[PDB]
From a paper:
To further confirm the direct binding between nomilin and hPXR, and discover more information on its structure and activation mechanism, we expressed the ligand-binding domian (LBD) domain of hPXR (residues 130–432) fused with residues 676–700 of nuclear receptor coactivator 1 (NCOA1676–700) at the C-terminal as a co-activator peptide. The purified hPXRLBD-NCOA1676–700 (hPXR chimera hereafter) was co-crystallised with nomilin and the structure of the protein-drug complex was determined at a resolution of 2.1 Å, allowing a detailed observation of the drug-target interaction. The hPXR chimera forms a homodimer in the purification and crystal structure, as previously reported. The dimeric hPXR forms an interface via the β1' strand of the characteristic antiparallel β-sheet. A region of non-proteinaceous electron density was identified in the Fo-Fc map of the LBDs of each of the hPXR protomers, and the molecular framework of nomilin fit the electron density very well. The electron density in protomer A was refined with better continuity than that in protomer B. The binding of nomilin in the hPXR chimera was majorly mediated by the hydrogen bonds formed by two carbonyl oxygens with S247 and Q285, as well as the strong hydrophobic interaction among the backbone carbons of nomilin, and the cavity formed by a series of hydrophobic residues including M243, W299, I414 and M425. Two methionine residues, M243 and M425, closely contact both nomilin and rifampicin in their crystal structures, respectively. In addition, one of the structural differences between hPXR bound with nomilin and rifampicin is the helix formed by amino acids 193–209, which is well-refined in our structure and previously reported structures of hPXR in complex with SR12813, clotrimazole, and hyperforin, but absent in the structure of hPXR-rifampicin complex. However, S247A/R, M425A/Q and W299R completely blocked the activity of nomilin, indicating that these amino acid residues are critical for nomilin-dependent hPXR activation.
In mammals, pregnane X receptor (PXR) is a major regulator of the expression of drug metabolism and xenobiotic detoxification genes. In mammals, PXR is a major transcription factor for regulating the expression of phase I–III drug metabolising/xenobiotic detoxifying genes. Nomilin is a naturally-occurring compound in citrus fruits such as lemons, grapefruits, oranges as well as in tangerine seed and peel. Here, we show that nomilin is a PXR agonist, and may extend lifespan and healthspan in C. elegans and mice via NHR-regulated detoxification functions, and induce the common transcriptome markers seen in the liver of mice in response to most lifespan-extending interventions.
Residue numbers in the entry:
A (entry chain B): 142 to 177, 192 to 310, 316 to 432, 446 to 461
B (entry chain A): 142 to 177, 192 to 310, 316 to 432, 446 to 460
Amino acid sequence: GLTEEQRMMIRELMDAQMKTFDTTFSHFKNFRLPGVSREEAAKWSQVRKDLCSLKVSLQLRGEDGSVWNYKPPADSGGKEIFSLLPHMADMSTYMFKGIISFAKVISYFRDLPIEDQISLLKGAAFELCQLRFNTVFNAETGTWECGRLSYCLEDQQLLLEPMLKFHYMLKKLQLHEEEYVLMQAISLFSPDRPGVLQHRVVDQLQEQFAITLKSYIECNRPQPAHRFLFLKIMAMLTELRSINAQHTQRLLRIQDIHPFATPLMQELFGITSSLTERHKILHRLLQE
Amino acid sequence: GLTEEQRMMIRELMDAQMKTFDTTFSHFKNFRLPGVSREEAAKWSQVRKDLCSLKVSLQLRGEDGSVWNYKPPADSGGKEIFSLLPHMADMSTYMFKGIISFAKVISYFRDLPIEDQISLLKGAAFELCQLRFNTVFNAETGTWECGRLSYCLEDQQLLLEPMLKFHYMLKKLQLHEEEYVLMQAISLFSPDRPGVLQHRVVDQLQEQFAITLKSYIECNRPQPAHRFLFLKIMAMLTELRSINAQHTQRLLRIQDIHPFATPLMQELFGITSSLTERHKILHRLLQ
Ligand SMILES: CC(=O)O[C@H]1CC(=O)OC(C)(C)[C@@H]2CC(=O)[C@]3(C)[C@H](CC[C@@]4(C)[C@H](c5ccoc5)OC(=O)[C@H]5O[C@]543)[C@@]12C
Ligand SMILES: CC(=O)O[C@H]1CC(=O)OC(C)(C)[C@@H]2CC(=O)[C@]3(C)[C@H](CC[C@@]4(C)[C@H](c5ccoc5)OC(=O)[C@H]5O[C@]543)[C@@]12C
């Protein structure tokens, strides 16, 4: 059995997840929709590879049963490849606000100095976003099922995209809600994000989330399908950190030649004195 | 061959058609799109019948190669069934303006008194719209191809709807452009529309268009096998008159419980002193 502190810890994380993850996306509104020669050669070739890996069609089900479907242009060579970027920025921004609320509700996060709160969220927002997205990923259809919104991979050869491989591999672990939310906490409380000052405090917090996860698995996963599950999850978290870094770089290349990121995204990802001045939205959201 | 008069009359109609039928729908813009308790319940049950006979899906192909597609809901029970009415009011209004412009170009129509011009257009506008829609109808895919915009039947049992049976049958006749525009003229110059005063003058003009059509077919098509093509065309026109009456009743019932018609549609369909004063937009458009 788990200890009382471990049971209480899982209860609090799960309560926070339920309060701050709009899994039906009911309150995601007012978003944008696609309308109805030197080193620049190499910059465009890269950004074209970057966006082609991120290629999905979009579905919007009306309350009535009606369905709008958007298929992106099939090409790659001009401003047509950027047509979903405003929408993607709005969705991402909505998800990031839910993750910021997730952190704020957690006692262990609330008590950190506000500058470390900023640094941890800068370091983890994309990671916790993928973890939440994975819970609504349908691996059979290659579709993220977001309430009335659906994102469907265009189309083996897609497993070559580390982002997509992550989602398929994580889904195959068949994790419980408790295990997702402990992955979120472990990634959130990463002691070695840039700018974090209380390394030792955050590190001791992370270690207790990891011990709670390992213990949860031991009490609830007797089957041989789940041998080494704890260590697989920890490896997946290390992979998520690498995919995080590849995205930060990917986003900056796209932003350079085609601005699209929202102000909160620019703050989270470093797009241009002290930590609190340079992140006024994050600072405001944390004081609320 | 045709008489030189007949040849000139066909050329006038072809020129009017060329000037006023935006066959690619390039200038249909700014249209609306479906957003992202006694006798009254008996009115709703009839309007539900009226609307589900008028259900298509909507496709919009962007210039960049992207495609937006809209599927309408199942009837259920509520205002969801009205979701495409604003868009259709915009399509119809666009098509009606092109038909008013069509009529205006034609010497034989221009020479009629303004009140009969109004009456003939009120009587025939919907018919000429369907004749023009037929020319962009793809019978194999059940789709009206309107440039970058398509209306697709969803789906044998749809041949039960007179409107759809009309488009499939007319398409099967494989008419020439010249035969369609003569069909438009014969429908437009119908003497028996409500309010027409110069019945005999209009009847004689219609007969000259019918005679021109009959002779066109005699002279251009391989005599036998097209033996009764003219009469088949005339029977399609009769059927179009009845579809026009059914749709007017349909539109009026829908309008009553869910207003959607544009001002021009209100004038054309009688939706509320002299015929001019009750049709100020039509009057303006004709001068
Ligand atoms: C692979 C991809 O296309 O991802 C698409 C669809 C998809 O296949 O899977 C998931 C769910 C993983 C993926 C999650 C995700 O992270 C978002 C929401 C993303 C859309 C584009 C980006 C990457 C956006 C960006 C960055 C640069 O150009 C756009 O940057 C962001 O921070 C995030 O919005 C995302 C989404 C929906
Ligand atoms: C069967 C149907 O779904 O018809 C659809 C699609 C279709 O399959 O075929 C065509 C293309 C011929 C057909 C032509 C047509 O006439 C319009 C534009 C119509 C939509 C509804 C109506 C009838 C509208 C009305 C009246 C009452 O409620 C709306 O009134 C009007 O005057 C016209 O807009 C029309 C349209 C697009």
